[PDB]
Amino acid sequence: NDESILLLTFLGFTGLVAKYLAPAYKDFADARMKKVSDVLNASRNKHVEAVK
């Protein structure tokens, strides 16, 4: 009935929630672990040449 249509509409909205047209938070997170990983490359190596 009317109730079933409302759930279907939000599932379509939830489907649109799935896209966000390439969501920023996806790339906002994507920028993070690379930033997190890269500094550990620099920081750990920073004391590597300390003994070198």
Partner 1 sequence: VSTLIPPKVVSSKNIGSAPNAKRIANVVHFYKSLPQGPAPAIKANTRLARYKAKYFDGDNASGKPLWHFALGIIAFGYSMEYYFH
Q: To which residue do tokens 């997170």 refer? A: 29
> Residue 24 or 50: which CB sits closer to partner 1?
50
> For residues 16 and 38, which CB has a smaller minimum distance to partner 1 in the complex?
16
Binding mask 7-26 for partner 1 (x = CB under 8 A): x------x--xx--------
Residue 10: phi and psi, rounded to 5, are -70, -30
Distances from the Cα of 23 to the Cα of 14, 17, 41, angstroms: 14, 9, 28
Interface residue list for partner 1 (CB under 8 A): 7, 14, 17-18, 47, 50-51
